[PDB]
Amino acid sequence: STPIQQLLEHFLRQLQRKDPHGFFAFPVTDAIAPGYSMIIKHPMDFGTMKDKIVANEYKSVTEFKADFKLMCDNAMTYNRPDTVYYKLAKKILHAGFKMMS
Ligand SMILES: CCCn1cc(-c2ccc3c(c2)c(C)cn3CC2CCNCC2)c2sc(C(=O)NC3CCS(=O)(=O)CC3)cc2c1=O
């Protein structure tokens, strides 16, 4: 693991702690959420981010932050504000960006 992979693995562990039930652990498919692909063109989840750290695909912390922000933005676009999905995405987006700053 390079120094960048080490820092990103730390940030991912800290972010995943805020999601104990794994709401963000897997890719959201149309079978799971009807019409998802018609609303969300670039899906993102913690599992895909973990594979990118392991494959050394993040050249900077900025790229990792963009995937994290995309995952949360997708949840806040597809889900209504009264839902658990939206509230958790908004809470983790703020906490996550505060922590990595
Ligand atoms: C949080 C952002 C990501 N994320 C995640 C889920 C979701 C789906 C299945 C889930 C879970 C969570 C959990 C904890 C367990 N499972 C079982 C799976 C686990 C993996 N292997 C298959 C079984 C949903 S579900 C939904 C929806 O149904 N949204 C509607 C909500 C009401 S609305 O009016 O907003 C229309 C959209 C929107 C999302 C969504 O964005």
CSV table of C-alpha atoms and ligand atoms in Angstrom, one decimal:
chain,number,residue,atom,x,y,z
A,1,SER,CA,0.0,0.0,0.0
A,2,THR,CA,1.3,3.4,-1.1
A,3,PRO,CA,1.0,6.4,1.3
A,4,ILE,CA,-2.1,7.6,-0.7
A,5,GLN,CA,-3.7,4.1,-0.4
A,6,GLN,CA,-3.1,4.2,3.4
A,7,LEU,CA,-4.7,7.7,3.9
A,8,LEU,CA,-7.7,6.7,1.7
A,9,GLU,CA,-8.2,3.3,3.6
A,10,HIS,CA,-8.3,5.4,6.9
A,11,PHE,CA,-10.9,7.8,5.4
A,12,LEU,CA,-13.0,4.9,4.1
A,13,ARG,CA,-13.0,3.1,7.4
A,14,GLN,CA,-14.0,6.2,9.2
A,15,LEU,CA,-16.8,6.9,6.7
A,16,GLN,CA,-18.1,3.3,6.8
A,17,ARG,CA,-18.4,3.6,10.6
A,18,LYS,CA,-21.2,6.2,10.0
A,19,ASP,CA,-23.1,3.5,8.0
A,20,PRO,CA,-23.3,0.4,10.3
A,21,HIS,CA,-26.2,-1.2,8.4
A,22,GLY,CA,-24.4,-0.9,5.0
A,23,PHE,CA,-27.0,1.3,3.2
A,24,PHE,CA,-24.0,2.5,1.0
A,25,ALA,CA,-22.1,-0.7,0.8
A,26,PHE,CA,-23.3,-2.0,-2.6
A,27,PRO,CA,-24.3,-0.7,-6.1
A,28,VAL,CA,-27.9,0.4,-6.3
A,29,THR,CA,-29.4,-1.5,-9.3
A,30,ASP,CA,-32.8,-1.0,-11.0
A,31,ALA,CA,-34.0,-4.4,-9.6
A,32,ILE,CA,-33.4,-2.9,-6.0
A,33,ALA,CA,-34.7,0.6,-6.8
A,34,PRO,CA,-37.0,0.9,-9.9
A,35,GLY,CA,-36.1,3.7,-12.4
A,36,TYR,CA,-32.7,4.3,-10.6
A,37,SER,CA,-30.7,4.3,-13.9
A,38,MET,CA,-33.1,6.8,-15.5
A,39,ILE,CA,-32.3,9.3,-12.7
A,40,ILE,CA,-28.7,8.5,-11.7
A,41,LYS,CA,-26.2,8.2,-14.6
A,42,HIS,CA,-23.1,7.6,-12.4
A,43,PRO,CA,-23.8,5.3,-9.5
A,44,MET,CA,-21.3,5.1,-6.6
A,45,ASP,CA,-21.0,3.1,-3.4
A,46,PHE,CA,-18.4,2.3,-0.6
A,47,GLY,CA,-17.7,-1.1,-2.1
A,48,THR,CA,-16.7,0.3,-5.5
A,49,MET,CA,-14.6,3.0,-3.7
A,50,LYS,CA,-12.8,0.2,-1.7
A,51,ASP,CA,-12.0,-1.7,-4.9
A,52,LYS,CA,-10.6,1.5,-6.4
A,53,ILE,CA,-8.3,2.0,-3.3
A,54,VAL,CA,-7.1,-1.6,-3.6
A,55,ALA,CA,-6.5,-1.2,-7.4
A,56,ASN,CA,-4.5,2.0,-6.7
A,57,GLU,CA,-6.9,4.0,-8.9
A,58,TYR,CA,-7.1,7.1,-6.8
A,59,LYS,CA,-4.3,9.5,-7.8
A,60,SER,CA,-5.3,12.1,-5.1
A,61,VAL,CA,-7.6,12.7,-2.0
A,62,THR,CA,-9.6,15.1,-4.3
A,63,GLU,CA,-10.6,12.1,-6.6
A,64,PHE,CA,-11.7,10.1,-3.5
A,65,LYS,CA,-13.7,13.1,-2.2
A,66,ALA,CA,-15.5,13.4,-5.6
A,67,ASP,CA,-16.6,9.7,-5.5
A,68,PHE,CA,-17.8,10.1,-1.9
A,69,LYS,CA,-19.7,13.3,-2.8
A,70,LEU,CA,-21.2,11.6,-5.9
A,71,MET,CA,-22.5,8.7,-3.8
A,72,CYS,CA,-24.2,11.1,-1.4
A,73,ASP,CA,-25.5,13.4,-4.1
A,74,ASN,CA,-27.1,10.4,-5.9
A,75,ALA,CA,-28.9,9.4,-2.7
A,76,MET,CA,-30.2,13.0,-2.2
A,77,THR,CA,-31.4,13.2,-5.8
A,78,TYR,CA,-33.2,9.9,-6.1
A,79,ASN,CA,-34.7,9.9,-2.5
A,80,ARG,CA,-37.3,12.4,-1.1
A,81,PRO,CA,-36.1,14.5,1.9
A,82,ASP,CA,-38.4,12.7,4.5
A,83,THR,CA,-36.7,9.3,3.8
A,84,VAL,CA,-34.0,7.5,5.8
A,85,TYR,CA,-31.9,7.3,2.6
A,86,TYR,CA,-31.8,11.1,2.0
A,87,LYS,CA,-31.3,11.9,5.8
A,88,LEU,CA,-28.4,9.4,6.1
A,89,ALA,CA,-26.8,10.7,2.9
A,90,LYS,CA,-27.0,14.3,4.0
A,91,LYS,CA,-25.6,13.5,7.5
A,92,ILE,CA,-22.7,11.4,6.2
A,93,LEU,CA,-21.9,13.9,3.4
A,94,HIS,CA,-21.4,16.7,6.0
A,95,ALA,CA,-19.5,14.6,8.6
A,96,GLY,CA,-17.3,13.0,5.8
A,97,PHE,CA,-16.2,16.3,4.3
A,98,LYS,CA,-15.6,17.8,7.7
A,99,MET,CA,-13.4,14.8,8.7
A,100,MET,CA,-11.3,14.8,5.4
A,101,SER,CA,-10.6,18.5,5.6
B,1,LIG,C1,-28.5,5.2,0.9
B,1,LIG,C2,-28.3,5.4,-0.6
B,1,LIG,C3,-28.3,4.1,-1.4
B,1,LIG,N1,-29.6,3.4,-1.4
B,1,LIG,C4,-29.8,2.2,-0.7
B,1,LIG,C5,-31.0,1.5,-0.7
B,1,LIG,C6,-31.1,0.2,0.0
B,1,LIG,C7,-31.5,-0.9,-0.8
B,1,LIG,C8,-31.5,-2.2,-0.3
B,1,LIG,C9,-31.0,-2.4,0.9
B,1,LIG,C10,-30.6,-1.3,1.7
B,1,LIG,C11,-30.6,0.0,1.3
B,1,LIG,C12,-30.3,-2.0,3.0
B,1,LIG,C13,-29.8,-1.3,4.2
B,1,LIG,C14,-30.5,-3.3,2.9
B,1,LIG,N2,-30.9,-3.6,1.6
B,1,LIG,C15,-31.1,-4.9,1.1
B,1,LIG,C16,-30.1,-5.2,0.0
B,1,LIG,C17,-28.6,-5.1,0.4
B,1,LIG,C18,-27.6,-5.5,-0.7
B,1,LIG,N3,-27.9,-6.8,-1.4
B,1,LIG,C19,-29.3,-6.9,-1.8
B,1,LIG,C20,-30.3,-6.7,-0.6
B,1,LIG,C21,-32.1,2.2,-1.3
B,1,LIG,S1,-33.8,1.6,-1.3
B,1,LIG,C22,-34.2,3.1,-2.1
B,1,LIG,C23,-35.7,3.4,-2.4
B,1,LIG,O1,-36.5,2.4,-2.3
B,1,LIG,N4,-36.0,4.6,-2.5
B,1,LIG,C24,-37.4,5.1,-2.7
B,1,LIG,C25,-37.8,5.7,-1.3
B,1,LIG,C26,-39.1,6.5,-1.3
B,1,LIG,S2,-39.1,7.8,-2.5
B,1,LIG,O2,-40.5,8.3,-2.6
B,1,LIG,O3,-38.0,8.7,-2.1
B,1,LIG,C27,-38.7,6.9,-4.0
B,1,LIG,C28,-37.3,6.3,-3.8
B,1,LIG,C29,-33.2,3.9,-2.4
B,1,LIG,C30,-32.0,3.4,-1.9
B,1,LIG,C31,-30.6,4.0,-2.0
B,1,LIG,O4,-30.6,5.1,-2.6
